[PDB]
Design a protein around this ligand. Structure first.
Ligand SMILES: [Cu+2]
Length: 128
């Protein structure tokens, strides 16, 4: 029925949800990210990245190393299934991905690659 969901990353380094469920009927899925708080992109920026759980660490490691002008994401990274832009306070961004590529029942992981956030800003994403 509904293939979208609005998520938030506040100035406390946290997402307002830690688990997403994609409905079996959804052929594509949308996540609209927004940033409540007062802090700037260089201090408390967030993004939304999807990858398999096993790929997370690498994606972060290389992400952080990728630097800011790169939305803390290795450019052209094959491990990234989907991702938004790194956004600062008072901003928003959205991404819509191809569900047919997802493996039903596989618990994927989504998270922010901004330095030091992933440990606390991560969660599951499962296709029902
Ligand atoms: Cu973050």
């Amino acid at each position: 029925a509904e293939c979208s969901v609005d998520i938030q990353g506040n100035d406390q380094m946290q997402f307002n949800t830690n688990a997403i469920t994609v409905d079996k009927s959804c052929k594509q899925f949308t996540v609209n990210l927004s940033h409540p708080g007062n802090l700037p992109k260089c201090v408390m920026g967030h993004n939304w990245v999807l990858s398999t759980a096993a790929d997370m660490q690498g994606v972060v490691t290389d992400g952080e190393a990728s630097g800011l002008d790169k939305d803390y994401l290795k450019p052209d990274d094959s491990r990234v299934i989907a991702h938004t832009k790194l956004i600062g306070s008072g901003e928003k961004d959205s991404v819509t991905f191809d569900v047919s590529k997802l493996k039903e029942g596989e618990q994927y992981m989504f998270f922010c690659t901004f330095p030091g956030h992933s440990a606390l800003m991560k969660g599951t994403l499962t296709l029902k």
